[PDB]
């Protein structure tokens, strides 16, 4: 009387009465608990089946279906409140939930009920996108799909698309997957049509579901060199070192062996540069605080850009490469077998304490090439560019840690460590 048109509100709307009746009916159709005697549980099951059949005979499932038909024409509690009163508006959602729970409970165990009103699944799936009754509609759909194979016979391509779109719109819901499983198999018998539809409509795109892959462990190796450029004390802003490899394997087990090298920044004036968490498939160049090169592409922020160079190649065995670092006006420069490559990372932030670094996956023998006390140079550095063995501070030892932490294959006797300081040093008195 209120929904058809604007009429004077001398109408009976027993909101609390119908809510109490719905709760009482939900309790009336309660399945027996599993912590009961077998005989009593069977008696309760038989009584519940008799009650469900008697309710079916009066066609009251259709009655609650038409009740939710008349009640779903609104959009929200606010929409219902100004039309049917504040109490009805604020109880509308609860009434919808109770009605859907009662509908599910009336049909939870029956095969006959599901076969009887399977003809209404075109309706429920169409209104599944209510967004305030989606859980109840999904529960009813699952409990009607599990029991009667007749319901599966009328499931069409559009319903599969609707369910997949509901999953893609509402997120990772584990009940949608159960519904899909029930659609695929009902009673020891499979539906090849539904299986094929789900297979070719759910995961060609890989945006869903949660993807998966097997990758290789990668770690880095860096020496005790820190390079901080600022006003005042400067270190010539020019560095250079070479690199060679003894043995390498293009594919050791299943994927291409990671092998990159470059210069990595730091966080402020402290070690532990930002980027990958640690123990990943990401080395140097897979973040914005490291810039690496692997022979074909320039890596920066896990985005590779291929670069031209005479005789394109990966870092095969017996390959000598050179790395130059200038800080202020130019940037990090690479040379493959003497002649420079045709790409380099200009206009990058100079904040941080830069250092050389090399990342590898497995099956590799790497040799840093510094001068003087640490080795020879296979090629002549460009003018001005010094090396790391001179970059080391006067009267301090120089060794090579991995990149950040104790990435050592060791037992419980590992020195597990907390935060550190910014070296306490990274102008005369007036």
């Amino acid at each position: 009387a209120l929904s058809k048109k604007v009429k004077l509100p001398t109408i009976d709307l027993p909101i609390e009465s119908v809510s109490l009746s719905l709760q009482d009916l939900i309790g009336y159709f309660h399945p027996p608990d599993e912590h009961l005697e077998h005989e009593d549980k069977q008696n309760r099951l038989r009584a519940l089946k008799n009650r469900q059949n008697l309710f079916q005979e009066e066609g009251m499932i259709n009655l609650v279906l038409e009740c939710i038909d008349r009640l779903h024409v609104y959009s929200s509690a606010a929409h219902f409140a100004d039309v049917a009163g504040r109490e009805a508006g604020e109880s509308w959602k609860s009434i919808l939930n109770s009605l859907y729970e009662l509908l599910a409970a009336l049909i939870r165990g029956n095969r006959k009920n599901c076969a009887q009103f399977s003809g209404s699944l075109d309706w429920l799936i169409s209104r599944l996108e209510r967004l305030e009754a989606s859980s109840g509609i999904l529960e009813v759909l699952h409990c009607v799909l599990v029991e009667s194979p007749e319901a599966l016979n009328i499931i069409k391509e559009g319903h599969i698309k609707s369910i997949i779109s509901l999953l893609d719109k509402h997120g990772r819901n584990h009940k949608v997957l159960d519904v899909l499983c029930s659609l695929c198999v009902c009673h020891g018998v499979a539906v090849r049509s539904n299986q094929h539809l789900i297979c070719d409509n759910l995961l060609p795109g890989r945006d869903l579901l949660l993807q998966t892959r097997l990758v290789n462990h990668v770690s880095s190796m860096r020496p005790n060199i820190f390079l901080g450029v600022s006003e005042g004390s400067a270190q010539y802003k020019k560095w250079y070192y070479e690199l060679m490899v003894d043995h390498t394997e293009p594919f050791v087990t299943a994927e291409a062996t990671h092998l990159r090298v470059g210069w990595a920044s730091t966080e402020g004036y402290s070690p532990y540069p930002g980027g990958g968490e640690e123990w990943g498939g990401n080395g140097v160049g897979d973040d914005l605080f490291s810039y690496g090169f692997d022979g074909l592409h320039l890596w920066s922020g896990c985005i590779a850009r291929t670069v031209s160079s005479p005789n394109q190649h990966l870092l095969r065995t017996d390959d000598v490469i050179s790395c130059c670092l200038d800080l202020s006006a130019p940037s990090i420069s690479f040379r493959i077998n003497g002649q420079p490559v045709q790409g380099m990372f200009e206009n990058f932030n100079i904040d941080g304490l830069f250092f050389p670094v090399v990342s590898f996956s497995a099956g590799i023998k790497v040799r840093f090439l510094l001068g003087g006390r640490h080795g020879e140079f296979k090629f002549l550095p460009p003018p001005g560019y010094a090396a790391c063995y001179e970059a080391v501070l006067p009267k301090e030892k120089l060794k090579v840690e991995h990149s950040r932490e104790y990435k050592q294959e060791r037992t419980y006797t590992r020195d597990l460590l907390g935060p550190t300081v910014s070296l306490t040093q990274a102008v005369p008195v007036d």
């Binding site: 006797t413 597990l416 460590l417 550190t420």
Partner: protein, 184 residues
């Protein structure tokens, strides 16, 4: 462990290296924590990089509400201390091979930096807001001619930023000095 603190942990598995277990514990019926195990403990730690998380309802000094004409997702806070916050949307916009441009239009017309470079990326919408006593700056998906998000601010809008960002895990109160590099 605090600053410059290094230690060692022993859950068992080496009774030959459990030094003072024989002094105390072995007599009054105390066992090592993981004595009946065949493999070492995973040893979880507090990770340092602050990745994004969904706003928890049971979180104070932060409240996000959803309403809905046009839709929006409004904010609120009740706190006595202020900081800078790095709110980000759930999932990003993917740019194909050809398309590569981003224009920021204020209350007037287009007037911002030339951020138009993306061969194939995923820009996640975000805004970095300073916490005020009353902070209602929120996001509204609007429509003029194409994809358009309006991060509507309120009074005291001078250090809040609104843009689209890829995976970036850096917690600090700064304006510029953002990580960047131009490959030639």
């Amino acid at each position: 462990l605090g600053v410059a603190q290094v230690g060692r942990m022993n859950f068992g598995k080496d009774v030959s290296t459990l030094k003072y277990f024989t002094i105390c514990g072995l007599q009054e019926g105390y066992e090592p924590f993981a004595v009946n195990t065949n493999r070492d403990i995973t040893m979880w730690l507090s990770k340092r990089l602050p990745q994004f998380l969904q706003v928890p309802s049971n979180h104070e000094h932060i409240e996000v509400t959803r309403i809905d004409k046009v839709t929006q997702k409004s904010f609120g806070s009740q706190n006595n201390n202020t900081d800078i916050m790095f709110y980000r949307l759930s999932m990003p916009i993917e740019c194909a091979x050809x398309x590569x441009x981003x224009x920021x239009x204020x209350x007037x017309x287009x007037x911002x930096x030339x951020x138009x470079x993306x061969x194939x990326x995923x820009x996640x919408d975000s805004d970095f807001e300073v916490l005020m006593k009353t902070a209602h700056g929120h996001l509204v998906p609007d429509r003029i001619d194409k994809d358009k998000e309006t991060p509507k601010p309120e009074f005291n809008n001078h250090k809040d930023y609104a843009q689209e960002k890829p995976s970036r895990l850096k917690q600090x109160x700064x304006x510029x000095x953002x990580x960047x590099x131009x490959x030639x």
